[PDB]
Ligand binder design. Structure first.
Ligand code: NA
Length: 182
């Protein structure tokens, strides 16, 4: 079996964050569907310095290069952003403005977001999904959207979200043709 390279992009501007907690909950259950995997994180909240210094892919700062390569070489991408101005954060977007635009074609992508309100639940399908559709990535059908009520501080605490995570993982296992049994 091939080790599946999983890269997790957390778009929060600050740490700790509910978006991070949502991504952790997903990541924690990932080994139940993938027999071999390496999981790596790209956390915007720690990259503001490297991000500012990077205006083109080929000229990106040496310290951002590892994060870009990881995304560009991932077998599976999990992405999450809190909702800002009814979309993902601009710094999360700046990251993807640098990511090679041929590199994600056909790559499975899980979309996730956290918001202050349910009113922006459509950000998943009208903002995050189109972003990854530009890359022609294989966005997976079930996106995660959790508003503030789903969390205890920054930890996911909502049984309905834990269940939807399991449905996401069903689709991850199916995509990698992992013989369906857990
Ligand atoms: Na790739």
């Amino acid at each position: 079996a091939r080790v599946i390279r999983v890269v997790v992009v957390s778009g929060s501007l600050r740490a700790p964050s509910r978006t991070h907690g949502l991504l952790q909950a997903l990541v924690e259950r990932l080994p139940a569907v993938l027999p071999k995997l390496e999981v790596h994180w790209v956390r915007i909240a720690e990259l503001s310095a490297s991000l500012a210094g990077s205006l083109e892919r080929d000229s990106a700062s040496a310290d951002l290069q590892p994060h870009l390569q990881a995304i560009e070489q991932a077998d599976l991408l999990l992405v999450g952003s809190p909702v800002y101005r009814a979309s993902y954060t601009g710094l999360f977007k700046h990251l993807f403005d640098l990511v090679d635009h041929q590199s994600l074609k056909g790559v499975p992508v899980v979309l996730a977001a956290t918001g202050g309100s349910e009113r922006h639940a459509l950000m998943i399908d009208h903002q995050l999904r189109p972003l990854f559709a530009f890359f022609q990535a294989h966005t997976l059908p079930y996106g995660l959207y959790a508003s503030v009520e789903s969390f205890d501080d920054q930890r996911l605490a909502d049984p309905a979200q834990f269940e939807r995570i399991e449905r996401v993982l069903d689709t991850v296992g199916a995509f990698f043709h992992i013989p369906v049994a857990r």
